[PDB]
Structure formats: C-alpha cells, structure tokens
Design a protein around this ligand. Structure first.
Ligand code: CL
Ligand code: CL
Length: 243
C-alpha cells in the first residue's frame, strides 16, 4: 500500500531514484520520502512514525538499544568541498581537523590565498556531521565557534557555491562541476577509492526498521534496492554498491 520513509538528506536523492524505478515494478505501491536528517529518521523508525528510517551513518550506541533491523543499501564517501575558484586542491586529514577546530584560520596556511577560512558544518542530527567528526577526529565541543551551520546537504552545497572562501562536507552524490572536492592525503574523492579504503572519510547508507512494522510492500522496496537493477541506480548516483 503506502510506505512512509524519513531521514538522511544524503540518502534522499538515491531513495527518490529507487522509488521512481520501483513504481514501474510494483505499481500498486506508493512510497513517501521526507528528508529530515539521519538522527530524526532513526528516531521516527524507532517510534513507528516512519515504517523505514534512512541513515547515512552507523547507528550510535544509544540507538542500538531499540533493536532496529539494519540493511546496508550502499556506501558513500564524504567530500571536502570548496568554491570552484579556490587554488587549494589538496588537504591532509590532519589539516582538515585543524581547520574544523580553528587551529588553521586562513587559506595562506594551506598555501592558498591570504583570506579567512569560512568553515561550514551541518546541523546537529546530521549523519554526515557525526561520521565526519568521528573519522577526522574531533568532538562537537571542539568545532570552531566561527563555523557556519547549514541545514541539510542542499544548503551546505549552496553556501560553498556562493562563498569563495568557504569549505564544507557533503555526500559524493551531491558533488558536481559547481564546486570542487579536494584530494585528501593525495587521494581523489571517488567511489573506487572509498571501496579500496584509501579514501578514509566514508560511511554506509542504511534502511532501518522495526520487524513488527515492515509491510510486504516495504520489504519488496528494500529487496528492489538490493537487486541488480536497484544497485545499478546506486552506482549512477556516484555511490558504492553493497560489497
Ligand atoms: Cl543495549
Ligand atoms: Cl545545529
């Protein structure tokens, strides 16, 4: 019948592409997808507000308590994006930590322009923010007080597009010619390099649900996403197919 899904903004676009193709496979099934961030999607799945929650990170310890079933539908790299005109094309993971904690505050320190770094972070509740902080190696408390907060993947892309001195983080699936992803420790931000583990900033895309709430229609949609046709859609969105 009608399958309610809510959660990650990183997963939103591939989920919409999956729903569009699934409408030709099971025409009597309707899927409603709402993008509200990973933490809210997981909470909605836990409470039965959504039949399926979308997360762009592993579940936190406190969320593991709920006993949600977890299904990996893809893997995704997190790119460090700058304005397309920034001469800096390379950052080390150590430099990324120093920028985000406010130890490095001007692009001149990174060999770029004599200009301040406009640090952009996602809102609290973002799966991308939680995975990024964990891998880069700093706590929320250590984030520079000068950081801009952008609500959702779309807004962090828009802020970086419009500010020559900005830096932000986003799913590879949102990267296009309007922004530039830096190489991290000499490694290009590609699905190949996420899969061979040389590009360290990455995370799963998960569909989470309570076994008692998942309908035959919801189960059919997850199975479609994991099928060869479902995984071809995942690759077309610059994601990594489930290994
Ligand atoms: Cl527990
Ligand atoms: Cl916030």
């Amino acid at each position: 019948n009608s399958v309610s899904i809510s959660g990650s903004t990183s997963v939103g676009p591939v989920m919409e592409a999956e729903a569009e193709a699934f409408k030709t496979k099971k025409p009597d099934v309707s899927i409603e997808i709402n993008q509200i961030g990973s933490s809210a999607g997981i909470k909605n799945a836990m409470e039965g507000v959504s039949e399926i929650g979308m997360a762009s990170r592993d579940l936190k310890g406190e969320e593991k308590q709920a006993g949600l079933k977890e299904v990996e539908i893809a893997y995704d790299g997190i790119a460090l994006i700058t304005h397309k005109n920034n001469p800096v094309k390379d950052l080390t993971l150590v430099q990324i930590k120093d920028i985000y904690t406010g130890k490095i505050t001007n692009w001149k320190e990174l060999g770029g322009n004599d200009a301040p770094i406009v640090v952009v972070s996602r809102e609290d509740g973002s799966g991308t923010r939680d995975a990024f902080q964990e891998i880069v190696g700093f706590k929320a408390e250590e984030l520079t007080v000068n950081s801009q907060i952008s609500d959702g993947s779309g807004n962090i892309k828009s802020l970086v597009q419009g500010n020559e001195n900005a830096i932000g983080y986003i799913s590879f699936s949102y990267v296009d010619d309007s922004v530039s992803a830096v190489k991290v420790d000499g490694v290009e931000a590609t699905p190949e390099n996420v899969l061979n583990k040389s590009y360290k900033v990455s995370r799963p895309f998960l569909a989470v649900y309570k076994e008692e709430n998942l309908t035959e229609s919801g189960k059919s949609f997850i199975d479609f996403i994991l099928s060869e046709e479902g995984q071809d859609i995942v690759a077309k969105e610059h994601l990594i197919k489930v290994k």
